[PDB]
């Protein structure tokens, strides 16, 4: 009489359990998505890190090769200037002689 | 140990999946459980109802035979009273004829 | 982005943890389910054994009582014959003596 | 009443099984935390390098143009001092010819 009734409740609790493992199953699939995206993300991050260092190195090399070029320029000009100041001195001193010789005759 | 954290996370997730299948199996079995208990109750209630039936019968069949046999005792008593009376009748009658033979000579 | 996959993954895990607690509760209700049913079966099982005893007890009286009276019947039957016998004896004597009187 | 017993047994078993689920879920929770920890080690690292690069540009484009504003600043000196050579040369040749006269 109230044996059908207890069985019933019994079956209800079992049925709640079934539905519930149902959500469980799916949320597990999301947990799986999570780790898989994390793997994808870390992979990209590997990619990025070998490329980062490489990029830095490249930049450095470039800057360097384009610096020892520039300071070869700087000294070259210092020389030329050193020389043109020399010509200037040669010419000042020489001109005086010529003008003194001119007063003399 | 790069991917080893993603991995271990992934295995756990799978293990959960295997464990919850096992759950589904064991709930199916709990469900069998309740279905069958209802089966058995039905059976038991039948047994109960049948046992009482066959008690009632016994009581009726029983008190029926008693009355049939108490009846028959009755008639047999009467018949013995009739026969016994008849025996005492013929004893008296006898003695009276015996005497008429003695008082004859 | 990094933080999001963790965030979302972890939430999932927690939701499952959550939902297992619910399972345990309902399992306990199932357990209650069966213990109730067991009680009821115990009862029904006692009720049963009782009738199987009465029935037998009832058979044992019926059996016996009937036997009683059926014996009472037989002894009356014999007594009935004995008296029907003794009668015979006497109708015999009667006719015989009554003739002797007729003669004389 | 075999059904109770068996039913009861299955129930107990779900209970056992569900606790195993709980342990494995705790172990998944662990995964996600270990991973988050590394995404941090990792983001940090990357971040540090971008920063290291950018600072290299700030050394680079400041050094270069500190030394190119040294080029042209010597160049102007060259142009001007060698304008003085052309002055003095023409003027030497003038004077030389006033001599020979």
Swiss-Prot record, chain B:
Which organism's genome codes for this protein? Homo sapiens (Human)
Coiled-coil regions listed: 21-105
Q: Does the keyword RNA-binding apply?
A: no
UniProt membrane topology term = Single-pass type II membrane protein; Lipid-anchor; GPI-anchor
- Report the glycosylation sites: 18, 45
Q: Which residues lie on this side of the membrane: Extracellular?
A: 2-105
Q: How is it modified after translation?
A: Monoubiquitinated by KSHV E3 ubiquitin-protein ligase K5, leading to its targeting to late endosomes and degradation.
> What is the protein name given in its UniProt record?
Bone marrow stromal antigen 2
Compartment list: Golgi apparatus, trans-Golgi network; Cell membrane; Membrane raft; Cytoplasm
* Further comment: Tetherin shows evidence of positive (adaptive) selection, presumably as a result of evolutionary pressure applied by antagonistic viral proteins that counteract its inhibitiory activity and this has led to the species-specific tetherin sensitivity to viral countermeasures. For example, Tantalus monkey tetherin cannot be abrogated by HIV-1 VPU due to variation in the tetherin transmembrane region. Similarly, SIV Nefs are able to overcome simian tetherins, but not human tetherin, due to a unique 5-amino-acid deletion in the cytoplasmic tail domain of human tetherin.
Query: What triggers production of this protein?
Result: By type I interferons. (Microbial infection) Down-regulated by HIV-1 VPU protein. Antagonizes its function by targeting it to the trans-Golgi network, sequestering it away from virus assembly sites on the cell membrane. VPU also acts as an adapter molecule linking it to BTRC, a substrate recognition subunit of the Skp1/Cullin/F-box protein E3 ubiquitin ligase, inducing its ubiquitination and subsequent proteasomal degradation.
Q: Name one GO molecular function term.
A: metalloendopeptidase inhibitor activity
In the record, the note on similarity to other proteins reads:
Belongs to the tetherin family.
> Signal sequence: where?
none
Q: Name one GO biological process term.
A: response to type II interferon
Does the keyword Oxidoreductase feature in the UniProt annotation?
no
Q: What is its main location?
A: Golgi
Curated annotation (Swiss-Prot), chain C:
Q: Name one GO cellular component term.
A: membrane raft
Glycosylated at which positions? 18, 45
Superkingdom is Eukaryota
Where does this chain mainly localize?
A: Golgi
Record topology, Extracellular segments = 2-104
The UniProt family comment states: Belongs to the tetherin family.
Name of this protein: Bone marrow stromal antigen 2
- Its source organism is Homo sapiens
From the UniProt record, report the name of the gene that encodes this protein.
Answer: BST2
Q: What range of the full-length protein does this chain span?
A: 48 to 151 of 180
Swiss-Prot record, chain D:
Q: How is expression of this protein distributed across tissues? A: Predominantly expressed in liver, lung, heart and placenta. Lower levels in pancreas, kidney, skeletal muscle and brain. Overexpressed in multiple myeloma cells. Highly expressed during B-cell development, from pro-B precursors to plasma cells. Highly expressed on T-cells, monocytes, NK cells and dendritic cells (at protein level).
Q: Name one GO cellular component term.
A: azurophil granule membrane
Membrane-side (Extracellular) residue stretches: 1-101
Report the membrane topology from the UniProt record. Single-pass type II membrane protein; Lipid-anchor; GPI-anchor
Keyword hit for Ligase: no
Residues listed as glycosylation sites in the UniProt record: 16, 43
GO BP: B cell activation; defense response to virus; innate immune response; negative regulation of cell growth; negative regulation of cell migration; negative regulation of intracellular transport of viral material; negative regulation of plasmacytoid dendritic cell cytokine production; negative regulation of viral genome replication
Keyword Membrane among UniProt keywords:
yes
- What UniProt keywords apply to this chain's record, in alphabetical order? Antiviral defense, B-cell activation, Cell membrane, Coiled coil, Cytoplasm, Disulfide bond, Endosome, Glycoprotein, Golgi apparatus, GPI-anchor, Host-virus interaction, Immunity, Innate immunity, Isopeptide bond, Lipoprotein, Membrane, Signal-anchor, Transmembrane, Transmembrane helix, Ubl conjugation
| Location relative to the cell | Golgi apparatus, trans-Golgi network; Cell membrane; Membrane raft; Cytoplasm
Positions in coiled-coil regions = 19-101
User: What post-translational events are described?
Assistant: Monoubiquitinated by KSHV E3 ubiquitin-protein ligase K5, leading to its targeting to late endosomes and degradation. The GPI anchor is essential for its antiviral activity.
Main localization (coarse): Golgi
The family assignment reads: Belongs to the tetherin family.
What is the official name of this protein in its record? Bone marrow stromal antigen 2
Organism, as annotated? Homo sapiens
Give the taxonomic lineage as stored in the record.
Eukaryota, Metazoa, Chordata, Craniata, Vertebrata
What's the name of its gene?
Answer: BST2
Identify the segment of the full-length protein shown.
Answer: 50 to 150 of 180
């Amino acid at each position: 009489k109230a044996n059908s009734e207890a069985c019933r409740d019994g079956l209800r609790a079992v049925m709640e359990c079934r539905n519930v493992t149902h959500l469980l199953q799916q949320e597990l699939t999301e947990a799986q998505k999570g780790f898989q995206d994390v793997e994808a993300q870390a992979a990209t991050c590997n990619h990025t890190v070998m490329a980062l260092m490489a990029s830095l190195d490249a930049e450095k090399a470039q800057g360097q090769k384009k610096v020892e070029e520039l300071e070869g320029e700087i000294t070259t000009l210092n020389h030329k200037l050193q020389d043109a100041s020399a010509e200037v001195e040669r010419l000042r001193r020489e001109n005086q002689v010529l003008s003194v010789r001119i007063a003399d005759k």
